[PDB]
Design a protein around this nucleic acid. Structure first.
Ligand SMILES: [K+]
Ligand SMILES: [K+]
Ligand SMILES: [K+]
Ligand SMILES: [K+]
Ligand SMILES: [K+]
Ligand SMILES: [K+]
Ligand SMILES: [K+]
Ligand SMILES: [K+]
Ligand SMILES: [K+]
Ligand SMILES: [K+]
Ligand SMILES: [K+]
Ligand SMILES: [K+]
Ligand SMILES: [Mg+2]
Ligand SMILES: [Mg+2]
Ligand SMILES: [Mg+2]
Ligand SMILES: [Mg+2]
Ligand SMILES: [Mg+2]
Ligand SMILES: [Mg+2]
Ligand SMILES: [Mg+2]
Ligand SMILES: [Mg+2]
Ligand SMILES: [Mg+2]
Ligand SMILES: [Mg+2]
Ligand SMILES: [Mg+2]
Ligand SMILES: [Mg+2]
Ligand SMILES: [Mg+2]
Ligand SMILES: [Mg+2]
Ligand SMILES: [Mg+2]
Ligand SMILES: [Mg+2]
Ligand SMILES: [Mg+2]
Ligand SMILES: [Mg+2]
Ligand SMILES: [Mg+2]
Ligand SMILES: [Mg+2]
Ligand SMILES: [Mg+2]
Ligand SMILES: [Mg+2]
Ligand SMILES: [Mg+2]
Lengths: 177, 215, 177, 66
RNA sequence: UCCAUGGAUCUCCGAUCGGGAAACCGUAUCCAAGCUCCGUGGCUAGUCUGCGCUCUUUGGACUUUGAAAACUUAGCGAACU
RNA sequence: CGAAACCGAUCGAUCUAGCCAUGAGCAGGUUGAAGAGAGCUCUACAGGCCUUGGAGGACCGAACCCACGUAUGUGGCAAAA
RNA sequence: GCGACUGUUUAUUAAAAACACAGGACUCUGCUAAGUGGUAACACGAUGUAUAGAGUCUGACACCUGCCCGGUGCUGGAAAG
């Protein structure tokens, strides 16, 4: 209920209301998520829009009705990230895991999914961080080498490794001395 | 008291009387005993040593007996290469080809300022990702920023990298990474090491005690 | 003063073995068949857990096979323990603890034991055994066994299905070893 | 359900490198993805693998043919 | 006396600098800049320069959003009858 | 006009039941457990007597704690004396 | 006669032969123990480890404790259906 407005108030108070023109306000109104999330633990995980549900449990012969709930299939997992070169520990539903499979990884899911669908302030933070790192990677290039240079640089690295080992052992024995 | 326990191994704890954190009884028929102090016992004994049994004492916290033991043992021309066999540029990995910032204020700049620090990055904390170099992993590579004017081909030994074969790391957390991004926010003659151990049967003072390690 | 004691142990090492070093601790892989031990670790380097009460001891039955030993515990059950886990040679001290007896009610209060009321001396609001006029156990020729205050039986070999499943899983894992 | 992946090296029963193959999601997500033995079959990574393998295997073919 | 407008002074809790038996206690925030007075050190000694704090002006560093009847939109949701 | 009751949300362990921490209290007088030590006795340990000793949900009995019997009181001195 | 004993109990009509008790037996628990409370985290059990923890019945001490697994529970079992 009015989650978009309560998140927009926090973002405005962080960034300064003088900084934003009315067109930027109109554009920022359409990126802040306006979804219905009430449960506390869904604001701390990647649930992809699954929520709890409260309903009736009905008996077979008598038809008697008593309250019950359906919970999403939350699992705690480690997902590999290509630009961070490491695992991220999340609490994902299997629905979110299947969407990650379709997208091609957690990073590609964060890039592909727009801002309104992230559902969460932490989701906005993570999408922003991954986008900034990919924009950093978008301005780099690598240069490869010929096998003769491969051999030359391998020999140079061997020389520096053995010289560093000799100097470290000499420094250790002289400090012992 | 006749024999106060050693003050370096005495700890103080209260009684629960079967009451949990909520204050309600969970274990019945307990409470109202005598006062006790807790003794710290070496239950690991992982350090390999030699000892002399000094005394056998009384421990109210357990049925057996404990024993105090004192322990008696334990600048060169680098291969600068000017020849490159090919250039690969990561310009489609963002997924959307766009220009580079240093001006209108944009949504991405607003979200960068709203989640930035309270007061390039491809080094130190995380370094170069392995993905870039995935078509051929055992090849020496030199990452460099793409320049508007054509760059130089001179490459020293410090600027060339190769993931060896060891790497074909740590792990971030989804909800507790923002806080960490935010800045983190023999002795002398008058001394003798002693420990408390569980005494065995037929173990009196003056005897030898061994701790053995794998061989 | 200390080197003399080390030298005396070194001379006595000819006359003793690992099975006549009462009170010494060594890993289970170094011991022999028929060794009487106590204070067995379950995980290497965690601490002694298994045989710690007064007068109790365990016995080694089998040599290390695939790095595991078979040990007979004071309850009579046999277990397969990792051979890198330490133990202590001998029997735990004060073996006469189980034959001493009290003579008055206050000796139980000195140890912190409060009085215990039988369930047959209660009301139906408190115990499943309570109720009835005169001395009565509140089940007849069509009742049930003796029960705990929360309804579970306590005679005839009853144990809960969780414990049955866990012990069956452990025994089926230990049979293939 | 199965996934499409692109091999970066030679896996014994899967095939040679540079080739798209179908694997189980639990195989790819837990084994091949963290060890960089396969990449998802999306267009950016297919282009990356194709060009890098072209540049290196140009040298490899130049050495092997002559 | 009184009225209109503008000013000077303007204790404390609620309450937010920290603690707390509400109306009490403890508190020179921190760091660059340039200016009168102050004291001390050093020169070949004359419109000679170089070191400090206290208090003053202008910025920027930390954070203090905050109340409120009914209406609105959401979550959970009885029993008597 | 009138129930006994049922349900939701809060207030109560300053009385009372149990427990935790830190303090305090028990006039006076008896009885004499274990242990220990001189003269007898045993091959010798061991045993008997005597001396010492001061244990106990021990004995008698005030302060203190309780409330077993009778009488008084019954809008009482008192909704329990 | 009843209860072995010292104790405890219906504040305010019942202090007892009722409750407790030291002692006896049976069943479960191999330690991330069983058991208890909570949706869960977690806590007690326990900085304990089968000479230990929990449940049930009987109730010092002496002599004893016979027959029945058809019933109600509890428990073990390779298959076929
Ligand atoms: K009882
Ligand atoms: K009750
Ligand atoms: K009964
Ligand atoms: K009864
Ligand atoms: K009754
Ligand atoms: K109804
Ligand atoms: K006395
Ligand atoms: K009797
Ligand atoms: K009485
Ligand atoms: K009673
Ligand atoms: K029967
Ligand atoms: K039967
Ligand atoms: Mg009992
Ligand atoms: Mg009754
Ligand atoms: Mg109850
Ligand atoms: Mg019942
Ligand atoms: Mg009867
Ligand atoms: Mg009958
Ligand atoms: Mg204040
Ligand atoms: Mg409002
Ligand atoms: Mg009803
Ligand atoms: Mg309260
Ligand atoms: Mg209170
Ligand atoms: Mg006295
Ligand atoms: Mg007395
Ligand atoms: Mg009373
Ligand atoms: Mg008669
Ligand atoms: Mg009695
Ligand atoms: Mg008496
Ligand atoms: Mg009495
Ligand atoms: Mg009464
Ligand atoms: Mg009475
Ligand atoms: Mg615990
Ligand atoms: Mg009875
Ligand atoms: Mg019988």
């Amino acid at each position: 209920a009015f989650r978009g407005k309560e998140m927009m108030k926090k973002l405005v108070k962080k960034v300064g209301a003088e900084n934003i023109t009315p067109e930027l306000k109109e554009k920022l109104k359409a990126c802040v998520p306006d979804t219905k999330v009430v449960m506390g633990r869904a604001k701390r995980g990647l649930y992809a829009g699954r929520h709890i549900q409260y309903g009736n449990r009905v008996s077979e012969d008598g038809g008697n009705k008593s309250r019950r709930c359906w919970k999403p299939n939350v699992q705690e997992k480690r997902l590999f990230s290509y630009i961070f070169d490491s695992h991220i520990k999340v609490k994902v539903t299997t629905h979110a895991l299947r969407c990650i499979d379709k997208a091609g990884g957690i990073d590609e899911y964060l890039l592909k999914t727009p801002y309104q669908k992230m559902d969460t302030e932490m989701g906005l933070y993570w999408k922003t961080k991954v986008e900034a790192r990919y924009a950093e990677l978008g301005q780099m290039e690598v240069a490869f080498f010929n096998p003769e240079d491969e051999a030359k640089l391998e020999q140079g690295f061997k020389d520096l490794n053995i010289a560093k080992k000799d100097a470290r052992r000499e420094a250790r024995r002289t400090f012992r001395k | 008291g006749r024999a106060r326990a050693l003050r370096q191994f005495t700890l103080s704890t209260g009684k629960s009387a079967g009451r949990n954190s909520s204050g309600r009884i969970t274990v019945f028929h307990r409470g109202g005993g005598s006062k006790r102090l807790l003794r710290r016992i070496d239950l690991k004994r992982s350090t390999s040593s030699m000892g002399i049994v000094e005394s056998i004492e009384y421990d109210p916290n357990r049925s057996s007996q404990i024993a105090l033991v004192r322990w008696i043992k334990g600048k060169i021309l680098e291969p600068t290469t000017n020849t490159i066999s090919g250039l690969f540029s990561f310009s489609f990995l963002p997924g959307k080809v766009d220009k580079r910032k240093v001006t209108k204020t944009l949504v991405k700049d607003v979200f960068f300022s709203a989640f930035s620090s309270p007061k390039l990055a491809f080094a130190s904390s995380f370094d170069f990702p392995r993905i870039p170099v995935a078509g051929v992993s055992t090849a020496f590579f030199a990452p460099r920023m793409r320049q508007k004017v054509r760059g130089k081909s001179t490459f020293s030994l410090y600027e060339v990298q190769k993931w060896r074969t060891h790497s074909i790391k740590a792990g971030l957390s989804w909800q507790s990474f923002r806080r960490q991004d935010t800045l983190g926010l023999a002795c002398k003659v008058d001394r003798a090491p002693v420990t408390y151990i569980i005494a065995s049967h037929q173990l009196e003072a003056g005897k030898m005690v061994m701790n053995c390690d794998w061989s | 003063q200390n080197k003399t004691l080390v030298a005396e142990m070194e001379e006595k090492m000819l006359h003793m073995d690992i099975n006549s070093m009462i009170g010494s601790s060594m890993p289970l892989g170094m011991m022999r068949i028929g060794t009487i031990i106590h204070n067995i670790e379950m995980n290497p380097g965690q601490g002694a857990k298994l045989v710690r009460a007064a007068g109790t001891n365990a016995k080694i039955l089998k040599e290390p096979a695939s790095g595991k030993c078979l040990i007979k515990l004071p309850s009579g059950d046999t277990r397969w323990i990792n051979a890198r886990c330490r133990a202590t040679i001998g029997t735990v001290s004060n073996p006469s603890h189980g034959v001493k007896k009290l003579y008055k009610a206050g000796q139980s209060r000195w140890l912190g034991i409060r009085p215990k009321v039988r369930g047959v001396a209660m009301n139906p609001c408190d115990h499943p055994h309570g109720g009835g006029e005169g001395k009565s156990k509140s089940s007849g020729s069509r009742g049930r066994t003796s029960v705990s205050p929360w309804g579970k039986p306590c005679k005839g070999g009853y144990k809960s299905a969780s414990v049955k499943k866990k012990k069956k899983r452990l025994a089926a894992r230990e049979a293939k070893m | 359900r199965k996934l499409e992946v692109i091999l970066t090296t030679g896996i014994e029963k899967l095939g040679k490198g540079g080739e798209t193959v179908k694997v189980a999601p639990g195989y790819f997500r837990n084994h091949l993805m963290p060890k960089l033995l396969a990449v998802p079959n999306i267009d950016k990574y297919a282009h990356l693998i194709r060009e890098q393998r072209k540049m290196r295997n140009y040298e490899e073919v130049k050495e092997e043919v002559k």
